[PDB]
Amino acid sequence: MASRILLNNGAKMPILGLGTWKSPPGQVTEAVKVAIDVGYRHIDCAHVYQNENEVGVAIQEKLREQVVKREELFIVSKLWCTYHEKGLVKGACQKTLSDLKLDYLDLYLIHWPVGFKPGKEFFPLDESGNVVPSDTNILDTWAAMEELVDEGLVKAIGISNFNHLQVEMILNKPGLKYKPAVNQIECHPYLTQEKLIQYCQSKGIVVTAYSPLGSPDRPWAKPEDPSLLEDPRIKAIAAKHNKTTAQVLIRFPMQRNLVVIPKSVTPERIAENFKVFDFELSSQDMTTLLSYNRNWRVCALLSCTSHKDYPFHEEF
Ligand SMILES: NC(=O)c1ccc[n+]([C@@H]2O[C@H](COP(=O)([O-])OP(=O)(O)OC[C@H]3O[C@@H](n4cnc5c(N)ncnc54)[C@H](OP(=O)(O)O)[C@@H]3O)[C@@H](O)[C@H]2O)c1
Numbered sequence: 230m231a232s233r234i235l236l237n238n239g240a241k242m243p244i245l246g247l248g249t250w251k252s253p254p255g256q257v258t259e260a261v262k263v264a265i266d267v268g269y270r271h272i273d274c275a276h277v278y279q280n281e282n283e284v285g286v287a288i289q290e291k292l293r294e295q296v297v298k299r300e301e302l303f304i305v306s307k308l309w310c311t312y313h314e315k316g317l318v319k320g321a322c323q324k325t326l327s328d329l330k331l332d333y334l335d336l337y338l339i340h341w342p343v344g345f346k347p348g349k350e351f352f353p354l355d356e357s358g359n360v361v362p363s364d365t366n367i368l369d370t371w372a373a374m375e376e377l378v379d380e381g382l383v384k385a386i387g388i389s390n391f392n393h394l395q396v397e398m399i400l401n402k403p404g405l406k407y408k409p410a411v412n413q414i415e416c417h418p419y420l421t422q423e424k425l426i427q428y429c430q431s432k433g434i435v436v437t438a439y440s441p442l443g444s445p446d447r448p449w450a451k452p453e454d455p456s457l458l459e460d461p462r463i464k465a466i467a468a469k470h471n472k473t474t475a476q477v478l479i480r481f482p483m484q485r486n487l488v489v490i491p492k493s494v495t496p497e498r499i500a501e502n503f504k505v506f507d508f509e510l511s512s513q514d515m516t517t518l519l520s521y522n523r524n525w526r527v528c529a530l531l532s533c534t535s536h537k538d539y540p541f542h543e544e545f
């Protein structure tokens with residue numbers, strides 16, 4: 230299994246990265262240091278995660294120590310929903326760059342296809358709990374992302390949580406200058422995403438799978454929810470291969486030509502999760518894991534469901 234996938238901007242992206250959503254600020258510096266020490270070269274970040282400064286301390290220390298060169302790292306961040314305005318995109322990107330201690334990002338994503346009212350609050354609400362939209366559409370936001378490439382702030386741009394029709398809207402944009410390089414979407418055996426993945430791959434867009442372990446630490450988890458890590462059938466495939474369930478769950482998307490970004494702040498799990506280049510799931514294993522699809526999503530949010538661009542009404 231080759232470690233990197235070629236993007237449509239001509240750059241190579243490591244297929245395994247470290248996720249950072251929910252990584253506590255007092256733990257994420259060590260997590261990222263350990264990750265880089267054990268071989269990770271891709272870190273998935275976002276301003277809304279509120280820990281980019283601490284991620285950046287780790288990146289900078291490892292660059293200073295000459296554990297890695299900047300060109301060997303692939304750092305991803307995301308434009309939050311309250312910065313879908315022309316006049317706000319550059320400053321949002323620059324704040325992320327300053328926090329991460331970087332002079333460019335390898336990839337910058339529109340985090341959700343959904344613009345909110347700008348201001349201090351990440352989820353501005355009306356008095357009845359609906360998110361307050363921005364009138365700023367995904368095409369105008371995309372043009373602002375293209376400008377970041379042309380200013381040298383980012384090497385690649387992409388999208389996240391865009392449905393089929395929204396990806397198509399970008400591809401069909403009048404005057405489109407740069408195609409999205411990546412669409413980062415939730416994907417795991419309970420949400421297998423065959424339709425959207427095939428569409429994106431057919432257009433040369435690389436798909437990154439988020440929440441590949443089913444996000445057991447998501448703050449809205451309920452006791453009744455299905456659990457990938459505890460699913461005895463997945464455990465059975467893992468046992469057959471003498472690997473952990475998490476390792477199977479990480480290798481699965483890799484064999485679909487996806488990038489995958491498991492999160493951990495536990496050093497032993499960070500290392501575990503990287504040890505996925507030395508075994509292969511059979512085709513039968515792959516089809517069996519695909520068969521577990523239930524259309525079950527970690528990431529959805531009631532307060533945003535009436536926004537005109539909320540992505541999960543549409544089928545794929
Ligand atoms: N674009 C978006 O909208 C979006 C949305 C969601 C996620 N993401 C990105 O994708 C990343 C991954 O998704 P996620 O954070 O939702 O969840 P995840 O990676 O599916 O699961 C993370 C959870 O699994 C645990 N874990 C990690 N390795 C394990 C192992 N080997 N054995 C047992 N448990 C293990 C972690 O615990 P410990 O940390 O305590 O070890 C944590 O509780 C995020 O951090 C973020 O970077 C992006």
Ligand SMILES: O=C(O)COc1cc(Cl)ccc1C(=O)NCc1ccc(Br)cc1F
Nearest residue numbers: 250275277278279310341343528529530533
């Ligand atoms: O969005 C992510 O990356 C992970 O989920 C969250 C992370 C943070 Cl720090 C805060 C909140 C979420 C979170 O609630 N994400 C879900 C979400 C968000 C926005 C929209 Br328009 C739809 C939607 F389903």
